Amino acid sequence: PVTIIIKECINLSTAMPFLSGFIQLRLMLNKLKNLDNIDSLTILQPFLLIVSTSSISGYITSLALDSLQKFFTLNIINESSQNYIGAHRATVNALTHCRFDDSVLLKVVFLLRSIVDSPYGDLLSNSIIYDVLQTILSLACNNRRSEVLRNAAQSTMIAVTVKIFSKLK
Amino acid sequence: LPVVRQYLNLLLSLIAPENELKHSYSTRIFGLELIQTALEISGDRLQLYPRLFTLISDPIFKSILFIIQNTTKLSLLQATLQLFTTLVVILGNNLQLQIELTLTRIFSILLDPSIIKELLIEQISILWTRSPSFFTSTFINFDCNLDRADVSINFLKALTKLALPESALTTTESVPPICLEGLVSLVDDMFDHMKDIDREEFGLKKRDRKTEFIECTNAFNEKPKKGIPMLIEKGFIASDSDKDIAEFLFNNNNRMNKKTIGLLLCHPDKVSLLNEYIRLFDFSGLRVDEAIRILLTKFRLPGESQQIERIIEAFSSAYCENQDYDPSKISDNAEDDISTVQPDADSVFILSYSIIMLNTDLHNPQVKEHMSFEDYSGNLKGCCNHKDFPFWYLDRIYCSIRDKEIVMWFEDAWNNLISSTTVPLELLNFDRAIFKQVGPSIVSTLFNIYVVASDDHISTRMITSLDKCSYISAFFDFKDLFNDILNSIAKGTTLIMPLVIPVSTDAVRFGRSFKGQLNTVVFFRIIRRNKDPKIFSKELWLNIVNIILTLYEDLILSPDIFPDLQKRLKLSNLPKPSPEISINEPTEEEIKSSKKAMECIKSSNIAASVFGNESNITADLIKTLLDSAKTEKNADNSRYFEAELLFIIELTIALFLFCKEEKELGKFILQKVFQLSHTKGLTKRTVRRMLTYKILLISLCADQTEYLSKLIN
């Protein structure tokens, strides 16, 4: 089924311009029989609006990123979904820009690992993977963060380097 | 695959009632999320494996249910409700008996803190949302069976009770929109299934039997003495003789209260029934204490000793006939053999009394002194008819008593549960039982929210769903909901000084209120589309007639409803109702409201609303509209007495010309026309115009000659 997204919508609504978007999303996805012709940039755009901006506390961003990871792990977006390429482009594109204590960044890093390592990461544009690599390298090189997050950064950059240079074949 | 069973057993060990203090609540919410993910990844195929299915069915629902009623924090409750809702959606086909208990306990906690109720409603909301046919599907799957509860109707009843603004004290301010969403979705679902099907084509026997059974159970609990022959009345029993009636009680004891059977069997006249009640059961090969336990499971002990005496007498006498007599091998070296003891009636009668005493003093908490094991065996020294019982008889019974006590709160109720398990046109037809048992409640709550609330956006949705309810009542032939809807709207329209484009008290009250506008529009929107006049009652006819007459009271409704009749008979338009003063006092905000009312009635198509379509043309409308005539001049109503009579008369002539009952109904209206024509000195034009109508009535009717003679003379 695809009832997970409405459940995550009500889960994130308990935050007490974005709440109106989420309630519109719930009213839209009252519809049954799979996501169907929905123009799948909009099925999850308000989640990207939460993480993209820089005027919301870390708790809501962590909840939104958990929702995104839940959607990807359960594979809500698939090849059958309309415009899945654009959605999986936008989700990596938004995470590169500003965000956010350290657990939020590790959640972003783990989601980046999971997206890039999977088959759908192959569909990302070559102008975007450079931005992802720049972001992870900025995390790894910087020492102000906690050391264990730096080690996680180290491992993900090794993994995505192997995944990138494997494509050179 | 054994790894899956081991891992799920481990996740069971994470969250459980017994393993509460060992692990912290972060672990518990995490385990709830893990079980949710595991169910989500594969739940369609999880049913096939029975070793795993028992693990996900029987002992994890314990962990679910136990920490809804007992928990107080919010974070754990969120994840538990997440898992519960996912279990409902994914595995709704099977897993049907266990789920009913948790919905029942959910509504039990809901009806009777503040934030917890909001979380409960907000989390359970998705069941009706993602499955709009949920209320129907639970009715097919669960309600139609004879047994079990009836929580399908109680769901809508609980939502209805929670929907009002009265629940500010009970719950916080977020609940009412959340429940009202599903409450409106119920009515909105029906119009999706209405477009295909016409009225005349339409024009659950198990549910009929269930209604008969539930009414019989209610009466039998209320009064068994009348209930028994009433139960014979329904034909559910072979005959009056006690054999069949006694057979009925044992099979279906789960639904009946113990106290009812206890007070039924206590009376002295029915003591003969005990001669055949206990005859069915037979405890051969079992000890007396086990038989006493099964006996106490079936009914509650009385309080009065004399009442208890006959019940113990019947119980003790019943055992003796079951077992024959082979007592000649008395000895004390026996090791668990029962048949050697074959006591008389008095011996079993005395044996019965001492067995029951241990429960109400030793195990009871109110009494503090304990009679020991010593005094119990000390009591019966030379009490069983000059010979004592064997001293291994009482010790076995005392050991059997000490392990467990009899129960007449939560854990024990599960014990009876598992024993039950271990041991398009058709949808409409299966509909029409939902609305009958909830409809008055749903319309009452809708009207309460409509009248109390003030926002335009909510009220428009309310009135639209109200019209959906009216259409639903119209499709069937309920004729108690529909009159209530239209009558209460008629009350709600707010139509039950020097004027001029008139201005009036009723007009200015109309214009200044937004509430009346939607009521007046939607009401005659109902009246525009209809398929039978008989559903209307006398009160609604009075209401609409008073509406049209009150609109005629001022210069709102143009009385030119039937220009064809006037052009046929060659009269001018009827005389207008003659207001006070005319020129072109009021000023500023007085007129600007009232003109809007003059617009809104024109949006209602009031002329063609009730008179336009031919469905409402019937004897009731004419008969009550003639009754509506004032027939009396007064200084208060001297403005319009001359004109209302003409308006009523001509309107009835046009109405009567449509009806084809050209034999009977004309006599009544001709009678009332001639009764009306003799008012005190009405003006010249009125009597001038009335004779044309009178000649027309004389033409319409048949063999009405005396009135024509009086007309000439």
mmCIF file with all atom_site columns, C-alpha atoms in Angstrom, chain B residues 310-451:
data_model
loop_
_atom_site.group_PDB
_atom_site.id
_atom_site.type_symbol
_atom_site.label_atom_id
_atom_site.label_alt_id
_atom_site.label_comp_id
_atom_site.label_asym_id
_atom_site.label_entity_id
_atom_site.label_seq_id
_atom_site.pdbx_PDB_ins_code
_atom_site.Cartn_x
_atom_site.Cartn_y
_atom_site.Cartn_z
_atom_site.occupancy
_atom_site.B_iso_or_equiv
_atom_site.pdbx_formal_charge
_atom_site.auth_seq_id
_atom_site.auth_comp_id
_atom_site.auth_asym_id
_atom_site.auth_atom_id
_atom_site.pdbx_PDB_model_num
ATOM 1   C CA . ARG B 1 310 ? -32.847 -25.019 47.911 1.00 0.00 ? 310 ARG B CA 1
ATOM 2   C CA . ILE B 1 311 ? -30.142 -24.395 45.304 1.00 0.00 ? 311 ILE B CA 1
ATOM 3   C CA . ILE B 1 312 ? -27.623 -26.424 47.306 1.00 0.00 ? 312 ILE B CA 1
ATOM 4   C CA . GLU B 1 313 ? -30.332 -29.064 47.838 1.00 0.00 ? 313 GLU B CA 1
ATOM 5   C CA . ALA B 1 314 ? -30.883 -29.418 44.093 1.00 0.00 ? 314 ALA B CA 1
ATOM 6   C CA . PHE B 1 315 ? -27.137 -29.389 43.384 1.00 0.00 ? 315 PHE B CA 1
ATOM 7   C CA . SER B 1 316 ? -26.391 -32.062 45.991 1.00 0.00 ? 316 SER B CA 1
ATOM 8   C CA . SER B 1 317 ? -29.349 -34.245 45.000 1.00 0.00 ? 317 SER B CA 1
ATOM 9   C CA . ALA B 1 318 ? -28.428 -34.079 41.306 1.00 0.00 ? 318 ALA B CA 1
ATOM 10  C CA . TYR B 1 319 ? -25.006 -35.719 41.719 1.00 0.00 ? 319 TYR B CA 1
ATOM 11  C CA . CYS B 1 320 ? -26.364 -38.864 43.402 1.00 0.00 ? 320 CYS B CA 1
ATOM 12  C CA . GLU B 1 321 ? -28.494 -40.005 40.460 1.00 0.00 ? 321 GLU B CA 1
ATOM 13  C CA . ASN B 1 322 ? -25.542 -39.625 38.071 1.00 0.00 ? 322 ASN B CA 1
ATOM 14  C CA . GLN B 1 323 ? -23.384 -42.204 39.889 1.00 0.00 ? 323 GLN B CA 1
ATOM 15  C CA . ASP B 1 324 ? -24.542 -45.737 40.685 1.00 0.00 ? 324 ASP B CA 1
ATOM 16  C CA . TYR B 1 325 ? -23.719 -47.617 43.928 1.00 0.00 ? 325 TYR B CA 1
ATOM 17  C CA . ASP B 1 326 ? -20.646 -49.820 44.467 1.00 0.00 ? 326 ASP B CA 1
ATOM 18  C CA . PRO B 1 327 ? -19.623 -48.837 48.028 1.00 0.00 ? 327 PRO B CA 1
ATOM 19  C CA . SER B 1 328 ? -18.900 -52.223 49.644 1.00 0.00 ? 328 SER B CA 1
ATOM 20  C CA . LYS B 1 329 ? -15.075 -51.834 49.362 1.00 0.00 ? 329 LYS B CA 1
ATOM 21  C CA . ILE B 1 330 ? -14.647 -49.031 51.911 1.00 0.00 ? 330 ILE B CA 1
ATOM 22  C CA . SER B 1 331 ? -11.021 -48.515 52.909 1.00 0.00 ? 331 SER B CA 1
ATOM 23  C CA . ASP B 1 332 ? -8.473  -45.816 53.758 1.00 0.00 ? 332 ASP B CA 1
ATOM 24  C CA . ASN B 1 333 ? -5.587  -47.227 51.643 1.00 0.00 ? 333 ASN B CA 1
ATOM 25  C CA . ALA B 1 334 ? -7.207  -45.872 48.451 1.00 0.00 ? 334 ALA B CA 1
ATOM 26  C CA . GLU B 1 335 ? -5.138  -43.630 46.152 1.00 0.00 ? 335 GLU B CA 1
ATOM 27  C CA . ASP B 1 336 ? -7.436  -41.400 44.061 1.00 0.00 ? 336 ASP B CA 1
ATOM 28  C CA . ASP B 1 337 ? -10.453 -43.635 43.433 1.00 0.00 ? 337 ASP B CA 1
ATOM 29  C CA . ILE B 1 338 ? -13.874 -42.014 43.757 1.00 0.00 ? 338 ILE B CA 1
ATOM 30  C CA . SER B 1 339 ? -16.452 -44.773 43.193 1.00 0.00 ? 339 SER B CA 1
ATOM 31  C CA . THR B 1 340 ? -16.006 -46.269 46.685 1.00 0.00 ? 340 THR B CA 1
ATOM 32  C CA . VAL B 1 341 ? -17.885 -43.284 48.171 1.00 0.00 ? 341 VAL B CA 1
ATOM 33  C CA . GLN B 1 342 ? -21.636 -43.456 47.413 1.00 0.00 ? 342 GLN B CA 1
ATOM 34  C CA . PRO B 1 343 ? -23.230 -41.172 50.009 1.00 0.00 ? 343 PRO B CA 1
ATOM 35  C CA . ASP B 1 344 ? -26.889 -40.651 50.806 1.00 0.00 ? 344 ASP B CA 1
ATOM 36  C CA . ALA B 1 345 ? -28.677 -37.433 49.872 1.00 0.00 ? 345 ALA B CA 1
ATOM 37  C CA . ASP B 1 346 ? -28.072 -35.956 53.335 1.00 0.00 ? 346 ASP B CA 1
ATOM 38  C CA . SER B 1 347 ? -24.351 -36.765 53.172 1.00 0.00 ? 347 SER B CA 1
ATOM 39  C CA . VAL B 1 348 ? -23.850 -34.885 49.899 1.00 0.00 ? 348 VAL B CA 1
ATOM 40  C CA . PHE B 1 349 ? -26.120 -32.117 51.233 1.00 0.00 ? 349 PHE B CA 1
ATOM 41  C CA . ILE B 1 350 ? -23.886 -31.624 54.289 1.00 0.00 ? 350 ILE B CA 1
ATOM 42  C CA . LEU B 1 351 ? -20.738 -32.035 52.161 1.00 0.00 ? 351 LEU B CA 1
ATOM 43  C CA . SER B 1 352 ? -21.878 -29.166 49.927 1.00 0.00 ? 352 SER B CA 1
ATOM 44  C CA . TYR B 1 353 ? -22.007 -26.565 52.712 1.00 0.00 ? 353 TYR B CA 1
ATOM 45  C CA . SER B 1 354 ? -18.480 -26.922 54.090 1.00 0.00 ? 354 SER B CA 1
ATOM 46  C CA . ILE B 1 355 ? -16.879 -26.651 50.630 1.00 0.00 ? 355 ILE B CA 1
ATOM 47  C CA . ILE B 1 356 ? -18.142 -23.135 49.863 1.00 0.00 ? 356 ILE B CA 1
ATOM 48  C CA . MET B 1 357 ? -17.148 -21.520 53.197 1.00 0.00 ? 357 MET B CA 1
ATOM 49  C CA . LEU B 1 358 ? -13.434 -21.362 52.343 1.00 0.00 ? 358 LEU B CA 1
ATOM 50  C CA . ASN B 1 359 ? -13.906 -18.734 49.618 1.00 0.00 ? 359 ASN B CA 1
ATOM 51  C CA . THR B 1 360 ? -15.762 -15.989 51.512 1.00 0.00 ? 360 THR B CA 1
ATOM 52  C CA . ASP B 1 361 ? -13.674 -15.808 54.744 1.00 0.00 ? 361 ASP B CA 1
ATOM 53  C CA . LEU B 1 362 ? -10.156 -17.169 54.180 1.00 0.00 ? 362 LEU B CA 1
ATOM 54  C CA . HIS B 1 363 ? -9.707  -15.705 50.689 1.00 0.00 ? 363 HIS B CA 1
ATOM 55  C CA . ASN B 1 364 ? -11.977 -12.701 51.273 1.00 0.00 ? 364 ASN B CA 1
ATOM 56  C CA . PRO B 1 365 ? -10.049 -9.577  52.409 1.00 0.00 ? 365 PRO B CA 1
ATOM 57  C CA . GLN B 1 366 ? -12.709 -7.991  54.668 1.00 0.00 ? 366 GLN B CA 1
ATOM 58  C CA . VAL B 1 367 ? -12.448 -10.697 57.346 1.00 0.00 ? 367 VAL B CA 1
ATOM 59  C CA . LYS B 1 368 ? -8.975  -10.822 58.927 1.00 0.00 ? 368 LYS B CA 1
ATOM 60  C CA . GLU B 1 369 ? -9.195  -13.915 61.148 1.00 0.00 ? 369 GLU B CA 1
ATOM 61  C CA . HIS B 1 370 ? -8.316  -17.184 59.384 1.00 0.00 ? 370 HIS B CA 1
ATOM 62  C CA . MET B 1 371 ? -9.814  -20.551 60.267 1.00 0.00 ? 371 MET B CA 1
ATOM 63  C CA . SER B 1 372 ? -6.897  -22.929 59.846 1.00 0.00 ? 372 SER B CA 1
ATOM 64  C CA . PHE B 1 373 ? -6.599  -26.324 58.205 1.00 0.00 ? 373 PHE B CA 1
ATOM 65  C CA . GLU B 1 374 ? -6.947  -27.820 61.705 1.00 0.00 ? 374 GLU B CA 1
ATOM 66  C CA . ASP B 1 375 ? -10.444 -26.539 62.488 1.00 0.00 ? 375 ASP B CA 1
ATOM 67  C CA . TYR B 1 376 ? -11.814 -27.478 59.046 1.00 0.00 ? 376 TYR B CA 1
ATOM 68  C CA . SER B 1 377 ? -11.077 -31.168 59.586 1.00 0.00 ? 377 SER B CA 1
ATOM 69  C CA . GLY B 1 378 ? -12.141 -30.622 63.199 1.00 0.00 ? 378 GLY B CA 1
ATOM 70  C CA . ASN B 1 379 ? -15.625 -29.491 62.148 1.00 0.00 ? 379 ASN B CA 1
ATOM 71  C CA . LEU B 1 380 ? -16.990 -32.710 60.631 1.00 0.00 ? 380 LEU B CA 1
ATOM 72  C CA . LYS B 1 381 ? -16.088 -35.071 63.502 1.00 0.00 ? 381 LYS B CA 1
ATOM 73  C CA . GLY B 1 382 ? -19.126 -37.342 63.562 1.00 0.00 ? 382 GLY B CA 1
ATOM 74  C CA . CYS B 1 383 ? -21.241 -35.109 61.307 1.00 0.00 ? 383 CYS B CA 1
ATOM 75  C CA . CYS B 1 384 ? -21.648 -37.461 58.304 1.00 0.00 ? 384 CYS B CA 1
ATOM 76  C CA . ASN B 1 385 ? -24.232 -39.691 59.994 1.00 0.00 ? 385 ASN B CA 1
ATOM 77  C CA . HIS B 1 386 ? -22.269 -41.272 62.867 1.00 0.00 ? 386 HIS B CA 1
ATOM 78  C CA . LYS B 1 387 ? -19.135 -42.061 60.726 1.00 0.00 ? 387 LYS B CA 1
ATOM 79  C CA . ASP B 1 388 ? -16.313 -39.663 59.903 1.00 0.00 ? 388 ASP B CA 1
ATOM 80  C CA . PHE B 1 389 ? -14.951 -38.890 56.454 1.00 0.00 ? 389 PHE B CA 1
ATOM 81  C CA . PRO B 1 390 ? -11.470 -40.141 55.478 1.00 0.00 ? 390 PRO B CA 1
ATOM 82  C CA . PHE B 1 391 ? -8.706  -37.732 56.406 1.00 0.00 ? 391 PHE B CA 1
ATOM 83  C CA . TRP B 1 392 ? -7.247  -37.776 52.869 1.00 0.00 ? 392 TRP B CA 1
ATOM 84  C CA . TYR B 1 393 ? -10.604 -36.510 51.530 1.00 0.00 ? 393 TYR B CA 1
ATOM 85  C CA . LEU B 1 394 ? -10.272 -32.947 52.855 1.00 0.00 ? 394 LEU B CA 1
ATOM 86  C CA . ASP B 1 395 ? -6.546  -32.448 52.203 1.00 0.00 ? 395 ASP B CA 1
ATOM 87  C CA . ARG B 1 396 ? -6.907  -32.916 48.434 1.00 0.00 ? 396 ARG B CA 1
ATOM 88  C CA . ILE B 1 397 ? -9.789  -30.428 48.347 1.00 0.00 ? 397 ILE B CA 1
ATOM 89  C CA . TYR B 1 398 ? -7.839  -27.931 50.468 1.00 0.00 ? 398 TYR B CA 1
ATOM 90  C CA . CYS B 1 399 ? -4.836  -28.221 48.146 1.00 0.00 ? 399 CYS B CA 1
ATOM 91  C CA . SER B 1 400 ? -7.143  -27.700 45.162 1.00 0.00 ? 400 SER B CA 1
ATOM 92  C CA . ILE B 1 401 ? -8.574  -24.615 46.893 1.00 0.00 ? 401 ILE B CA 1
ATOM 93  C CA . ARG B 1 402 ? -5.182  -23.127 47.776 1.00 0.00 ? 402 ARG B CA 1
ATOM 94  C CA . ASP B 1 403 ? -3.902  -22.939 44.182 1.00 0.00 ? 403 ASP B CA 1
ATOM 95  C CA . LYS B 1 404 ? -6.599  -20.681 42.698 1.00 0.00 ? 404 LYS B CA 1
ATOM 96  C CA . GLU B 1 405 ? -9.672  -18.689 43.733 1.00 0.00 ? 405 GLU B CA 1
ATOM 97  C CA . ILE B 1 406 ? -12.998 -18.506 41.897 1.00 0.00 ? 406 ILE B CA 1
ATOM 98  C CA . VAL B 1 407 ? -13.861 -15.281 40.040 1.00 0.00 ? 407 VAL B CA 1
ATOM 99  C CA . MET B 1 408 ? -17.376 -13.949 39.458 1.00 0.00 ? 408 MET B CA 1
ATOM 100 C CA . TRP B 1 409 ? -10.696 -8.302  36.011 1.00 0.00 ? 409 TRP B CA 1
ATOM 101 C CA . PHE B 1 410 ? -8.743  -7.832  32.764 1.00 0.00 ? 410 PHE B CA 1
ATOM 102 C CA . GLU B 1 411 ? -6.477  -10.881 32.458 1.00 0.00 ? 411 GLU B CA 1
ATOM 103 C CA . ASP B 1 412 ? -9.259  -13.401 33.167 1.00 0.00 ? 412 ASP B CA 1
ATOM 104 C CA . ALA B 1 413 ? -11.506 -12.000 30.413 1.00 0.00 ? 413 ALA B CA 1
ATOM 105 C CA . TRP B 1 414 ? -8.977  -13.201 27.828 1.00 0.00 ? 414 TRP B CA 1
ATOM 106 C CA . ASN B 1 415 ? -9.437  -16.799 29.044 1.00 0.00 ? 415 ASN B CA 1
ATOM 107 C CA . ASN B 1 416 ? -12.929 -17.104 27.572 1.00 0.00 ? 416 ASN B CA 1
ATOM 108 C CA . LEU B 1 417 ? -11.782 -15.399 24.351 1.00 0.00 ? 417 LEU B CA 1
ATOM 109 C CA . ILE B 1 418 ? -9.255  -17.873 22.949 1.00 0.00 ? 418 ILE B CA 1
ATOM 110 C CA . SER B 1 419 ? -11.503 -20.852 23.772 1.00 0.00 ? 419 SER B CA 1
ATOM 111 C CA . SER B 1 420 ? -13.848 -19.590 21.049 1.00 0.00 ? 420 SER B CA 1
ATOM 112 C CA . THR B 1 421 ? -11.010 -19.681 18.499 1.00 0.00 ? 421 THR B CA 1
ATOM 113 C CA . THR B 1 422 ? -8.990  -22.717 19.599 1.00 0.00 ? 422 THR B CA 1
ATOM 114 C CA . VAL B 1 423 ? -11.851 -25.175 20.135 1.00 0.00 ? 423 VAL B CA 1
ATOM 115 C CA . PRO B 1 424 ? -23.778 -2.231  -6.409 1.00 0.00 ? 424 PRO B CA 1
ATOM 116 C CA . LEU B 1 425 ? -27.426 -2.958  -5.625 1.00 0.00 ? 425 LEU B CA 1
ATOM 117 C CA . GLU B 1 426 ? -26.287 -5.520  -3.056 1.00 0.00 ? 426 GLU B CA 1
ATOM 118 C CA . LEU B 1 427 ? -24.315 -2.837  -1.206 1.00 0.00 ? 427 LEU B CA 1
ATOM 119 C CA . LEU B 1 428 ? -27.400 -0.623  -1.026 1.00 0.00 ? 428 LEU B CA 1
ATOM 120 C CA . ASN B 1 429 ? -29.437 -3.567  0.238  1.00 0.00 ? 429 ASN B CA 1
ATOM 121 C CA . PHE B 1 430 ? -26.765 -4.258  2.850  1.00 0.00 ? 430 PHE B CA 1
ATOM 122 C CA . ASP B 1 431 ? -26.975 -0.527  3.520  1.00 0.00 ? 431 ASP B CA 1
ATOM 123 C CA . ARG B 1 432 ? -30.181 0.971   5.044  1.00 0.00 ? 432 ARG B CA 1
ATOM 124 C CA . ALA B 1 433 ? -29.355 -0.704  8.398  1.00 0.00 ? 433 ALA B CA 1
ATOM 125 C CA . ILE B 1 434 ? -26.560 1.793   9.101  1.00 0.00 ? 434 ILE B CA 1
ATOM 126 C CA . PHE B 1 435 ? -28.750 4.893   8.865  1.00 0.00 ? 435 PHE B CA 1
ATOM 127 C CA . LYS B 1 436 ? -31.740 3.552   10.792 1.00 0.00 ? 436 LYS B CA 1
ATOM 128 C CA . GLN B 1 437 ? -29.823 3.182   14.078 1.00 0.00 ? 437 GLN B CA 1
ATOM 129 C CA . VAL B 1 438 ? -27.693 6.378   13.811 1.00 0.00 ? 438 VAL B CA 1
ATOM 130 C CA . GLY B 1 439 ? -29.578 8.916   11.649 1.00 0.00 ? 439 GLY B CA 1
ATOM 131 C CA . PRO B 1 440 ? -31.302 11.006  14.331 1.00 0.00 ? 440 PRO B CA 1
ATOM 132 C CA . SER B 1 441 ? -27.999 11.283  16.191 1.00 0.00 ? 441 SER B CA 1
ATOM 133 C CA . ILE B 1 442 ? -26.104 12.323  13.053 1.00 0.00 ? 442 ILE B CA 1
ATOM 134 C CA . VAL B 1 443 ? -28.624 15.002  12.095 1.00 0.00 ? 443 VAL B CA 1
ATOM 135 C CA . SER B 1 444 ? -28.847 16.262  15.688 1.00 0.00 ? 444 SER B CA 1
ATOM 136 C CA . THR B 1 445 ? -25.077 16.726  15.853 1.00 0.00 ? 445 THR B CA 1
ATOM 137 C CA . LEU B 1 446 ? -24.943 18.326  12.407 1.00 0.00 ? 446 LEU B CA 1
ATOM 138 C CA . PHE B 1 447 ? -27.639 20.803  13.412 1.00 0.00 ? 447 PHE B CA 1
ATOM 139 C CA . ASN B 1 448 ? -25.945 21.512  16.739 1.00 0.00 ? 448 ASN B CA 1
ATOM 140 C CA . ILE B 1 449 ? -22.661 22.371  15.030 1.00 0.00 ? 449 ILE B CA 1
ATOM 141 C CA . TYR B 1 450 ? -24.527 24.402  12.399 1.00 0.00 ? 450 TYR B CA 1
ATOM 142 C CA . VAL B 1 451 ? -26.467 26.472  14.935 1.00 0.00 ? 451 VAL B CA 1
#
